[PDB]
Amino acid sequence: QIVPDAATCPACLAEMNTPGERRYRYPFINCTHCGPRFTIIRAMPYDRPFTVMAAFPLCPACDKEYRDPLDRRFHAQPVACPECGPYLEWVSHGEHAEQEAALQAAIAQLKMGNIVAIKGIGGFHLACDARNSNAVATLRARKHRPAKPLAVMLPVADGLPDAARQLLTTPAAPIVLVDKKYVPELCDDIAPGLNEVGVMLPANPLQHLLLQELQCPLVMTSGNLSGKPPAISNEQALEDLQGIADGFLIHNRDIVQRMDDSVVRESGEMLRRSRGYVPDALALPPGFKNVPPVLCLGADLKNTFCLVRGEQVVLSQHLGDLSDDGIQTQWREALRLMQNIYNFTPQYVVHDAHPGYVSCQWASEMNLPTQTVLHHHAHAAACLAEHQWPLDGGDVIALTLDGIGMGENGALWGGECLRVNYRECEHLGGLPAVALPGGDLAAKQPWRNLLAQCLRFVPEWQNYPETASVAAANWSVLARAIERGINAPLASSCGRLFDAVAAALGCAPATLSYEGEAACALEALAASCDGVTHPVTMPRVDNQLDLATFWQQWLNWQAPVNQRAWAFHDALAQGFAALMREQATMRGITTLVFSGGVIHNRLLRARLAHYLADFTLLFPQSLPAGDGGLSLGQGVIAAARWLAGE
């Protein structure tokens, strides 16, 4: 049984910090309890010759420890020391150093406020002093990343809440999102416009050496070029990051598996499940047994695949956007190793009903029976599965809130009330479908969604101060395209409604730099309001929320921006609660399910829970509410259909 890549243990950290130890300051120290696992395995069985370490014959002292049954390094497969192992290399515009001198060059660069690329366990990071405004502005400039929050590595967890420290210090060593007020040392460009910062602890020997020396917070963000997957080879890091890093601290131990840092909230809520969790299998819910080998492809964004068999499922690491340049290489290596580990050969493939997906094209190429699952069905089913809802558990009413997923009959969904079981999804209602003006541009430019909302719902929309920029434009050409259905498909998208409101409030740039940016801004703004008496509502007309009434009341309720943002979250939750309550009570359903990336919104969760105290409420916690949990939902649905003899 292989275990996830594990944070350097206290015993290895002590050995590395003890002068006179053969492994004193050795940046590759590991033992049977810690070190890289999944990221250094070429093939099963887990044995040095089938790892990245086959290239490094052990010296006699290492070999004795590896063979000694009582030694902490007994069969530590990637074991090494300075004599026989990998070593550091420094590269910087015609400078070169090795070993300790390489480390020191990287340290000197970081202190002067430069950016260094650092080789990690599962890829490379870009690092700089997180207190240094200039360094962080430079990193943002070079990476064309003006807003997206940067992960920061702290030397210690001191000063953080108990819950954060506990998560930070596990073998998994995730990034943990923490209120930025706990970390005043960070410059303001770490998470601009947001209330939280992703903090992490050193969890490999190199990181410990760096933070021990530096004693300050360090930006520790993914070493990628935008639109590409992270580099895993030195040669790819050097190419990809040349415009960005001032120098490169690399080494000659290969990484074979892309494995990003995991990301959780302090509350324990899973956002991205990679390093430290993969490749642990999970038990399927009660009633799922003897399941055939099923490969589930997930969806195109925030991708994970899932292998289902027997009574367990195993999810891949996060693979990101499947449209990125050469992402198939990493996706396929992950699939090869995962199938090798679990001796798995699929008999069935499951993928999303969206016919334009890359993953769906990959599924067509496998020579296996294929079946599709609706995106929002899979969201709801992943949440059910996580909560161990039995195979014969009964129907729930589900609320699935996201950006875009293909619904029934070619409709674009994103804000739906559904009657769900593992085998069935019936659409009951939700948000009205509203045009996406300019198609893919709608997700990048919030004003487009405000325009689309106003055209549909707001008489004399041009007269409100909140629509001024849109009104000033020649918006009428777009209005014409919307009318004629020219690259303006209808979507009942909760994400785009967020964007429209954010556009009206001016709390995001006119053009976004990352997906979800306007919605994150709006949530961060609403979060500073502790609740307010307000008249804004979203009534229900049939089984849809009445946005005409919402816009009329919201646009005409002047108040501080945070309270306007709060009132929107509150009205949206109340409106969806009323829909779900009617649907569930009249079917004798007592349990409600929530999923989709928008359900990551804390305030919405809280308002929903507030309004729905008369129901058992199921929210995602150990898998992402977003597309990262989707493959699991596809897998339980396929399994349930198979178990029913369909």
Q: How far is the CB of 153 from Mg ion (least distance, A)?
A: 15
Residue 81 binds which entry of Zn ion, Mg ion, none, with Cβ cut-offs from 5 to 8 Å by kind? Zn ion
Q: Which of residues 49 and 159 has its CB atom nearest to Mg ion in the complex? A: 159
Binding site for Zn ion (CB under 5 A): 9, 12, 31, 33-34, 59, 62, 81, 83-84, 402, 405, 627
3-class DSSP state for residue 417?
Answer: strand
Residue 295 binds which entry of Mg ion, Zn ion, none, with Cβ cut-offs from 5 to 8 Å by kind? none
Q: Which of residues 45 and 159 has its CB atom nearest to Mg ion in the complex? A: 159
Residue 368 binds which entry of Zn ion, Mg ion, none, with Cβ cut-offs from 5 to 8 Å by kind? none
Q: Which of residues 194 and 503 has its CB atom nearest to Mg ion in the complex? A: 194
Q: Which of residues 18 and 463 has its CB atom nearest to Zn ion in the complex? A: 18
Residue 5 binds which entry of Zn ion, Mg ion, none, with Cβ cut-offs from 5 to 8 Å by kind? none
Could you tell me what percentage of the chain is helix, strand and coil, using 3-state DSSP and rounding each to the nearest 5?
Answer: 35, 20, 45
Q: Which of residues 66 and 331 has its CB atom nearest to Zn ion in the complex? A: 66
Q: What are phi and psi of 193, to 5 degrees?
A: 80, 5
Q: How far is the CB of 181 from Mg ion (least distance, A)?
A: 8
* Strand stretches in 533-600, DSSP E: 540-541, 544-545, 591-595
Cα 407 to Cα 427: distance, rounded to the nearest angstrom:
9
Residue 34 binds which entry of Mg ion, Zn ion, none, with Cβ cut-offs from 5 to 8 Å by kind? Zn ion
Per the document, the length of the chain is: 646
Neighbouring CB atoms inside 10 A of 101's CB total 12
Residue 9 binds which entry of Mg ion, Zn ion, none, with Cβ cut-offs from 5 to 8 Å by kind? Zn ion
Strands 396-406 and 591-595: parallel
Cα 354 to Cα 377: distance, rounded to the nearest angstrom:
13
Q: How far is the CB of 159 from Mg ion (least distance, A)?
A: 3
Q: How far is the CB of 634 from Zn ion (least distance, A)?
A: 12
**Dihedral of the alpha carbons of 596, 380, 412, 515, in degrees to the nearest 10:** 10
- ∠ at Cα 579 (575, 583), nearest 5°? 165
Residue 261 binds which entry of Mg ion, Zn ion, none, with Cβ cut-offs from 5 to 8 Å by kind? none
Listed in sequence order, the residues at least 6 apart from 562 whose beta carbon sits closer than 8 Å to its beta carbon are: 525, 526, 528, 529
Residue 337 binds which entry of Mg ion, Zn ion, none, with Cβ cut-offs from 5 to 8 Å by kind? none
Residue 84 binds which entry of Mg ion, Zn ion, none, with Cβ cut-offs from 5 to 8 Å by kind? Zn ion
Q: How far is the CB of 11 from Zn ion (least distance, A)?
A: 5
Q: Which of residues 62 and 291 has its CB atom nearest to Zn ion in the complex? A: 62
Cβ atoms of residues 104 and 77 within 8 Å: no
Cβ atoms of residues 299 and 359 within 8 Å: yes
Binding site for Mg ion (CB under 5 A): 159, 182
Nearest residue (beta carbon) to Mg ion: 159
User: For residue 416, what are the CA distances in angstroms to 51, 376, 542, 612?
Assistant: 47, 8, 14, 17
Q: How far is the CB of 507 from Mg ion (least distance, A)?
A: 27
**Tokens describing residue 561:** 């921006």
Cβ atoms of residues 32 and 74 within 8 Å: yes
Q: Which of residues 3 and 216 has its CB atom nearest to Mg ion in the complex? A: 216
Within 13 Å of residue 419, how many CA atoms lie on the same side as its CB? 14
Report CA 578 to chain centroid distance, whole Å: 30
Q: Which of residues 9 and 508 has its CB atom nearest to Zn ion in the complex? A: 9
Q: How far apart are the first and last CA of the chain?
A: 34
For the sheet with 152-153, list strands across it.
96-98, 88-91, 247-251, 116-119, 124-129, 218-222, 152-153, 196-200, 175-179, 263-265, 270-272
Q: Which of residues 82 and 149 has its CB atom nearest to Zn ion in the complex? A: 82
Strands 616-618 and 591-595: parallel
Q: How far is the CB of 197 from Mg ion (least distance, A)?
A: 11
Q: Which of residues 87 and 182 has its CB atom nearest to Mg ion in the complex? A: 182
Listed in sequence order, the residues at least 6 apart from 619 whose beta carbon sits closer than 8 Å to its beta carbon are: 383, 594, 599, 605, 625
Sign of the four-CA dihedral 399, 403, 406, 408: positive
Residue 567 binds which entry of Zn ion, Mg ion, none, with Cβ cut-offs from 5 to 8 Å by kind? none
Q: Which helix (H) or strand (E) holds 198?
A: strand 196-200
Residue 159 binds which entry of Mg ion, Zn ion, none, with Cβ cut-offs from 5 to 8 Å by kind? Mg ion
Q: Which of residues 83 and 239 has its CB atom nearest to Zn ion in the complex? A: 83
Q: What is the DSSP string of 605-646?
A: HHHHHHHTTTSEEE--SSS-SSGGGHHHHHHHHHHHHHHTT-
Residue 182 binds which entry of Zn ion, Mg ion, none, with Cβ cut-offs from 5 to 8 Å by kind? Mg ion
Q: How far is the CB of 590 from Zn ion (least distance, A)?
A: 26
Residue 523 binds which entry of Mg ion, Zn ion, none, with Cβ cut-offs from 5 to 8 Å by kind? none
Q: How far is the CB of 183 from Mg ion (least distance, A)?
A: 6
Q: Which of residues 81 and 291 has its CB atom nearest to Zn ion in the complex? A: 81
Report DSSP state, residue 263: E
> Which amino acid, 20?
G
Residue 95 binds which entry of Zn ion, Mg ion, none, with Cβ cut-offs from 5 to 8 Å by kind? none
Q: How far is the CB of 420 from Zn ion (least distance, A)?
A: 15
Of 596, 597, 554, the residue nearest 574 (C-alpha): 554
Q: How far is the CB of 185 from Mg ion (least distance, A)?
A: 8
Residue 358 binds which entry of Zn ion, Mg ion, none, with Cβ cut-offs from 5 to 8 Å by kind? none
Q: How far is the CB of 590 from Mg ion (least distance, A)?
A: 43
Q: How far is the CB of 97 from Zn ion (least distance, A)?
A: 22
Q: How far is the CB of 624 from Zn ion (least distance, A)?
A: 10
Q: How far is the CB of 14 from Zn ion (least distance, A)?
A: 9
Listed in sequence order, the residues at least 6 apart from 417 whose beta carbon sits closer than 8 Å to its beta carbon are: 397, 398, 399, 427, 428, 429, 430, 543, 576, 579, 580, 583
**Tokens describing residue 344:** 């798995």
